[PDB]
């Protein structure tokens, strides 16, 4: 008798590419990829995930908190991972801002990039010694405080010239000191109020357009105020007002000072943000539902099964599958053979 070595013959619907034999059918494959399905976003497994900056500040938007809107102060937990759920953050209270005239909207998205975020407990500028004659600090019914008295943004001081100071001024300069702790970035919020011709003189003793200039880390920004004829109040407390404020922020790196050159209507910086560390940030939506191995900008929360995945590549953090162009398969069988006669 003749005994030989032989190889099986079976149904071979699966195909893999080889270096030296091209594509070949095989009896079995191990799929190395899946195409994920879109899901709700979630908490990243093994890491506290930040959504709203201040989760317990109810009826407060992230921008509200960043500006220091009254009633919107609260615990802001540190986080190594943060969700960007507002590409263009909006306010929901206080005095009417003309947001789009500065970069101010992105301020809370800037903050969330840090692991640790706290508001300073002392003021960065003393309103009782600030250049431009003597001041009193102004408030508004648009910004009701913790005891529901008329207040203002805790990051700023709406300074008003005293009755012996209702006069136009040349641009005066205040130096903004660095008051944060070791390693922290300081994010200084400031701006200027403007109104119609009549209110300008009542408030400031000048109805000409005012000019403002900030300078920090080589960056100068210049603004000129507008007198009356404003766009409509939006994203505010809803109480009608004839004036508008312009708000801006100024980033001060460790040990770096900034300057603000201002005239009438200045919103002097008071409380400032002190931030450190880095939070890993991706686009997502709220609320966060449950846990996941991986947060993916396109698929939301997803758990890891196969080592790779096919579909829409995008930013993703956590224990994630690696994106590939094609659904790769590892051969688990033999190259096809016709049945032997």
């Amino acid at each position: 008798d003749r005994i030989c070595t032989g190889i099986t013959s079976s149904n071979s619907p699966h195909v893999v590419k080889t270096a030296t034999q091209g594509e070949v059918n095989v009896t079995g494959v191990i799929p190395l990829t899946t195409t994920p399905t879109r899901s709700h976003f979630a908490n990243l497994k093994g890491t506290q995930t930040r959504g709203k900056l201040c989760p317990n500040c109810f009826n407060c938007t992230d921008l509200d908190v960043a500006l220091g809107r009254p009633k919107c102060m609260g615990n802001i937990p540190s986080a190594k991972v943060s969700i960007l759920h507002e590409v263009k953050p909006v306010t929901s209270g206080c005095y009417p801002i003309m947001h789009d005239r500065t970069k101010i909207r992105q301020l809370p998205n800037l903050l969330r990039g840090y692991e640790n975020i706290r508001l300073s407990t002392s003021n960065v500028i003393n309103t009782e010694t600030a250049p431009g004659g003597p001041y009193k600090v102004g408030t508004s019914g648009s910004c009701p405080n913790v005891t529901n008295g008329n207040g203002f943004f805790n990051t700023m001081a709406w300074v008003i010239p005293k009755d012996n100071n209702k006069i136009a001024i040349n641009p005066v300069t205040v130096e903004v000191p660095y008051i944060c702790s070791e390693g922290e970035d300081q994010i200084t919020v400031w701006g200027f109020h403007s109104d119609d011709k009549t209110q300008m003189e009542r408030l400031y003793g000048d109805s000409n357009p005012q000019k403002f200039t900030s300078s920090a880390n080589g960056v100068t920004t210049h603004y000129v105020s507008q007198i009356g004829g404003f766009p409509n109040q939006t994203e505010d407390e809803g109480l009608k007002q004839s004036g508008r404020i312009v708000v801006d922020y100024m980033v001060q790196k460790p040990g770096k000072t900034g300057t603000i050159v201002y005239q009438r209507g200045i919103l002097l910086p008071q409380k400032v943000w002190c931030a450190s560390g880095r939070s890993k940030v991706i686009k997502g939506s709220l609320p966060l539902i449950g846990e996941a191995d991986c947060l993916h900008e396109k698929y939301g929360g997803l758990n890891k099964s196969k080592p790779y995945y096919t579909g829409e590549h995008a930013k993703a953090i956590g224990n994630c599958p690696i994106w590939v162009k094609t659904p790769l398969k590892l051969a688990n069988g033999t190259k096809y053979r016709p049945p032997a006669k």
Partner: protein, 169 residues
């Protein structure tokens, strides 16, 4: 493969070989018997399983957003960041594609190598009275029907079961 093609190994396959990927056939008066070798099949499966674990071990850095670059203000920068992500995805994908291609190249190529090793299993069992042809076949003095073949696949076959000489281990 290419070895078996040149060596004149049988290019076809045996539908009767079900319990495994590799094995033996017996041609005699009984017709044609077929048996799978589990040892050769298990080895092939283990190599692949190890190869799967190796491919699954790869880690690459997450791609997330820049902490400093703000929408609208830094859109030019953000465009470059998008490009950085896109090229990372592209490069690593092709690297994995290469790694997997080489894995399958090894797996498909190893088929004839299994056969060559199965020759060595068969040869020793058949004893010194058998004749090695060279195309992966041996000519025996004895009959070897399906019962005999099963003993070969199982490694329990003795040539003394036909009073033929053996290589004594």
């Amino acid at each position: 493969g290419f070895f078996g093609a040149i060596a004149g190994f049988l290019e076809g396959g045996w539908e009767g070989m079900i319990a495994g990927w590799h094995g033996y056939t017996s041609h005699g008066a009984h017709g044609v018997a077929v048996a799978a070798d589990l040892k050769s099949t298990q080895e092939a499966i283990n190599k692949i399983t190890k190869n799967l674990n190796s491919l699954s071990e790869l880690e690459v850095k997450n791609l997330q957003r820049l902490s400093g670059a703000m929408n609208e203000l830094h859109d030019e920068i953000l465009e470059l960041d998008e490009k950085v992500d896109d090229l990372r995805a592209d490069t690593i994908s092709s690297q994995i594609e290469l790694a997997v291609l080489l894995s399958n190249e090894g797996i498909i190529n190893s088929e004839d190598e299994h056969l060559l090793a199965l020759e060595r299993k068969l040869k020793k069992m058949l004893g010194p009275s058998a004749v090695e042809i060279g195309n992966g076949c041996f000519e025996t003095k004895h009959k070897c029907n399906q019962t005999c073949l099963d003993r070969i696949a199982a490694g329990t076959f003795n040539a003394g079961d036909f009073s033929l000489p053996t290589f004594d281990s």
